[PDB]
Amino acid sequence: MYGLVNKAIQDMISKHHGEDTWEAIKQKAGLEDIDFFVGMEAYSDDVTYHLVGAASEVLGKPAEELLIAFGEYWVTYTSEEGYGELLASAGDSLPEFMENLDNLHARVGLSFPQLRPPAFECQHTSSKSMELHYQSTRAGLAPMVLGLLHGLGKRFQTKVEVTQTAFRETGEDHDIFSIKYE
Amino acid sequence: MYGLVNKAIQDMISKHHGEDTWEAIKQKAGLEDIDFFVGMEAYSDDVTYHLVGAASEVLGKPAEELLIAFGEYWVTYTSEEGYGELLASAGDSLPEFMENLDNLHARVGLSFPQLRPPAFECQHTSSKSMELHYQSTRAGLAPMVLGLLHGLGKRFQTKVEVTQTAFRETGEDHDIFSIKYE
Ligand code: HEM
Numbered sequence: 001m002y003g004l005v006n007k008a009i010q011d012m013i014s015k016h017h018g019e020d021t022w023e024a025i026k027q028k029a030g031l032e033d034i035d036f037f038v039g040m041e042a043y044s045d046d047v048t049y050h051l052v053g054a055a056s057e058v059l060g061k062p063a064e065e066l067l068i069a070f071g072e073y074w075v076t077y078t079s080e081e082g083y084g085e086l087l088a089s090a091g092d093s094l095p096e097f098m099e100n101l102d103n104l105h106a107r108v109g110l111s112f113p114q115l116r117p118p119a120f121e122c123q124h125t126s127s128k129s130m131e132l133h134y135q136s137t138r139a140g141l142a143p144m145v146l147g148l149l150h151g152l153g154k155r156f157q158t159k160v161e162v163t164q165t166a167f168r169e170t171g172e173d174h175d176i177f178s179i180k181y182e
Numbered sequence: 183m184y185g186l187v188n189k190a191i192q193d194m195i196s197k198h199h200g201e202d203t204w205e206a207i208k209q210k211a212g213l214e215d216i217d218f219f220v221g222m223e224a225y226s227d228d229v230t231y232h233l234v235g236a237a238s239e240v241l242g243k244p245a246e247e248l249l250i251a252f253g254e255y256w257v258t259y260t261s262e263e264g265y266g267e268l269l270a271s272a273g274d275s276l277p278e279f280m281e282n283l284d285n286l287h288a289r290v291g292l293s294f295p296q297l298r299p300p301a302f303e304c305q306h307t308s309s310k311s312m313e314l315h316y317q318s319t320r321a322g323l324a325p326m327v328l329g330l331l332h333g334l335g336k337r338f339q340t341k342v343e344v345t346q347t348a349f350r351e352t353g354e355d356h357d358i359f360s361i362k363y364e
C-alpha cells in the first residue's frame with residue numbers, strides 16, 4: 001500500500017509506545033534498512049503485513065487488535081496530517097460518509113495514481129441501520145474496517161454496533177457487516 | 183431456550199412494530215399453534231431461531247441485526263419484568279458485571295433447572311479494555327452478545343466499543359470480543 005499507510009502505523013506505535021518499541025518492531029519486520037516511509041510512494045503490501053505481524057509479537061497483542069486500533073487511529077490521523085478537509089467533505093453522519101467513501105478514495109486516487117482502494121456498498125435496512133458490503137483486492141483487513149467504523153462513530157458522536165456476517169477469508173465473495181448506529 | 187427468551191422477543195417486536203406484525207412473524211415461523219410462551223418452560227432452540235428467521239423476512243432486516251437489537255432490549259426488559267434486583271446485584275460497571283455473569287446465570291439456573299447458560303471469561307487488558315471470551319453450546323448468538331454489551335454500556339452510562347476478533351461460525355473454538363469502554 002502507499003507509504004502513507006505505513007507512516008501512520010509508525011506514528012501510532014511511536015506515539016503510544018515510544019520510538020525504541022517502534023524500532024524494535026521495525027527491526028523484527030525485517031525493515032531496518034528503511035530510514036523513513038515515503039508517503040506518496042507505493043510499497044509492497046508485505047511491508048504492512050510484516051509490520052503488524054512484528055508488532056503483534058513485540059507488543060503481545062493479537063494482530064486483529066492492532067488492526068482495529070490502527071483503523072480507529074486513522075480517522076484522527078487523516079484529520080490532522082493533511083486530509084482533514086477531504087475527510088470533512090465526505091459527510092457529517094456515518095451513513096452518508098460510507099455512501100461517499102468510494103468517491104473519497106477516488107479523489108485520493110487522482111493524486112495516488114496506482115491506488116487500489118477498497119469498495120464499499122451500503123444497503124440501508126432502516127434510518128438507523130445498514131448492511132455494509134466491503135470489497136477488496138486484499139485479504140485480512142476486515143478488523144481494520146471495524147476500527148475505522150468506530151473512529152467514524154467517534155468523529156460523528158455516534159454509537160455504532162457492528163457485526164460481521166460474511167467472511168472473504170473462508171471463500172465467500174466478500175466481507176459483509178450488519179451495522180446499527182445511534 | 184426457556185420461554186422467557188421467546189416472550190422477550192415477542193414483547194420487543196410487539197412494542198416496536200405492533201401486534202399484527204408479531205402475529206405475522208409468529209405465523210411465518212410456523213408457531214401459530216402456540217397461544218403464549220411459558221416463561222419458565224423449556225422450548226426447543228428452534229423456536230427461537232425460527233422466530234428470528236421469520237422476523238428477518240417480515241421486517242426486511244438481517245437476522246444478525248435483530249439479534250443485536252434484542253440483546254440491547256434484553257437489558258431493559260430484565261430490569262423491568264422480574265429480574266431487576268438480580269441485575270443490580272451483578273455489579274455497577276461493565277467490567278464487573280461481565281466478571282459476575284456466570285454467577286448471575288448460575289443463580290438464574292437454580293430456578294431454571296435445565297438452563298444451558300453460556301460461559302464468559304474476561305481478560306482485562308487495561309483499566310479501559312478487555313478481551314471477552316464467549317463460550318456457548320449454541321451457534322449464531324454472538325451478535326446478541328454485542329447488543330447485550332451495548333445495553334450494559336447504557337445501564338452504566340459507559341461508552342463501549344465492541345469488536346469481534348474470533349468467530350465460532352468459521353470454525354474457531356469460540357467467539358472472542360475486544361472491548362474498549364469509558
Ligand atoms: C475514514 C474512513 C475510511 C475507511 C473506512 C477506509 C477504508 C479503507 C480500507 C479498508 C483500505 C484497505 C485497502 C483494501 O481494503 O484493499 C483503505 C486503503 C486506503 N485508503 Fe482508506 N478508508 C478511509 C478513509 C481514507 C482517507 C481519508 C484517505 C486519505 C488518505 C484514505 C486513503 C487510503 C489509502 C491511500 C489507501 C491505501 C490503498 C492502496 O495503497 O492501494 N482512506 N481504505
Ligand code: HEM
Nearest residue numbers: 183184260265268269290297298299300318319320323330
Ligand atoms: C437478569 C439478567 C439475565 C437473565 C435473567 C438471563 C437469563 C438467561 C436465560 C434464561 C438464558 C436462556 C438459557 C437456556 O434456555 O438454556 C440466557 C441465555 C443467554 N444469556 Fe443470559 N441472562 C441475563 C443476562 C445476560 C447478559 C447481560 C448477557 C450478556 C452480557 C447474557 C448472555 C446470555 C447469552 C449469550 C445467552 C444465550 C444462550 C447461549 O449462548 O448458549 N445474559 N440467559
